[PDB]
Nucleic acid binder design. Sequence first.
RNA 1: GGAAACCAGAGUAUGGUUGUGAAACUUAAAGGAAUUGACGGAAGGGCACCACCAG
RNA 2: AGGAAUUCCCAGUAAGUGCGGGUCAUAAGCUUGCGUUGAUUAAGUCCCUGCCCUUUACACACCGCCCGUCGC
Lengths: 290, 48, 43, 55, 31
Amino acid sequence: MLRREARLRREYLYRKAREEAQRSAQERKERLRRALEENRLIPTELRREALALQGSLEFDDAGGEGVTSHVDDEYRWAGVEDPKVMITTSRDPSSRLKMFAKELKLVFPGAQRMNRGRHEVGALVRACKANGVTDLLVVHEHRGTPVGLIVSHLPFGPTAYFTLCNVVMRHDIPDLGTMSEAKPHLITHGFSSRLGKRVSDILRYLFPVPKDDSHRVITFANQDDYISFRHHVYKKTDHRNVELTEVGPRFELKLYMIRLGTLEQEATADVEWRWHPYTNTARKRVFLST
Amino acid sequence: TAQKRPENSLLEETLHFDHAVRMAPVITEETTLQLEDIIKQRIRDQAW
Amino acid sequence: KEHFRAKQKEEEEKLKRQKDLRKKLFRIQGQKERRNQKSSLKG
Amino acid sequence: DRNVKIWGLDFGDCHKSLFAHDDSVMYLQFVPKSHLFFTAGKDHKIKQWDADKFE
Amino acid sequence: FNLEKARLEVHRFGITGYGKGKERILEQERA
RNA sequence: GGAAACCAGAGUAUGGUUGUGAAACUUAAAGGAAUUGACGGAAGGGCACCACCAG
RNA sequence: AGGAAUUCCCAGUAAGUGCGGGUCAUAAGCUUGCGUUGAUUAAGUCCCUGCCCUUUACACACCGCCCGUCGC
Ligand SMILES: [Mg+2]
Ligand SMILES: [Mg+2]
Ligand SMILES: [Mg+2]
Ligand SMILES: [Mg+2]
């Protein structure tokens, strides 16, 4: 199994290297295909090798997988199987942190929370991979308030680092009751840039495919690179009029890191994107919106 | 430096300087009502 | 090293003049390709 | 039609439109002292309204 | 109705009568 | 004899230009659709350190 | 040696102890890693508090119709 995991990773990185070549290889194919379909001069860059493209074009069919994308390879079983999420905390947690980790279990369908004792960081990733855990969440705290969040996709998936800003928990609010706990509908709003499409994908795949008539709503709203997490359930009193009742925790997120590897590989994994605060134009730039 | 100037002198100086990064947004009722409006619109349209 | 840098400078002006000279010749060749469009289907 | 409308005489502006009865309204009349009127319709009912507060 | 679109799709359907092998050589000739 | 003759072209990209009242009034689907619609009760199958039991 | 109420917790888990780092976010009487010693009770029911579903692949065997209201 250890050799299998090492073998698969090299295939994953190796395919990532040639994704740019294959996109360039594909893009020049349609221009020739457009050139033959509508009788017009073949572009001079395609003037040579034109017959070779035609032969591969004639081979092209629906059966082939097509051009490879690293996002698809990372999230291979996103739709077919329901995700399995495990939630843990840092060593020696506070009382309020153990409340927060208890609430994230209810938010994510099918999540489980395990006590972090003396478990080294490396061993947890090994155990999660062995038992088929899809996603791993690690949460930090400062003076009884959660302050950091890490989301990791176990099969050599991307690792996303977050910092929390305005956390309000249900345990603060009296006599709320019990949650609906049904499979939720997802509302993603404000993500427009290419990186914004990347980040919204990571957050969406933490959830299973819901039912059509589900009344549970989870909203991720981006406003000036700050993502707002909101949890609501609605009741249709009558046509065109809807009532919203808030349930669940309320907190904000700020992304500053995405790494290709897992949280066991800080020393080897490459950085897809980092937040650089000491750039001269750092204060006047946003990345999740265009 | 610090020694030359009197104590708490800069509190009234009204100097001009720049900030490194954007301050965190402040939550208010107006933000809450606006955000609920976005969710309500998508619920009516069933634009999940 | 100083010699090699100077040699690159001559090439850049040389390539610049090469583009302009071929530009006049290219348009004549382009006109011939128009005729091949009309005869593409026929033979 | 089931609606009843209040208008100002000075300029002809409609202040309010009310659902009132479930069928055609048959008769209307104000109380003498104040801006309260009584209405009757084919819905077996009698209702009174405050023209100022539209209630 | 555009002849240029119409001519080509007529031409493609015409070639298929010849046979699959004759398709390759004629399509090669065109390009 | 054939010019050192003879006579007198496409692609992208970036910008421009254009192509008798529904409110002053109304959340009663501007007053709907339905053989296709709207609700309530009971029973069975599971589950929980958002519940029991033992600590 | 910290009432009334209330929160959390099932195995290298609860609890005690030391030793490092400050890593482009957060962090100073704080934050995160690493190791050492290492337990008591429990492996099951819907009784309370609730949650998610249902009551229209014909091997053998087993079993043999959920109910009510208003609209059209
Ligand atoms: Mg401990
Ligand atoms: Mg310990
Ligand atoms: Mg005590
Ligand atoms: Mg310690």
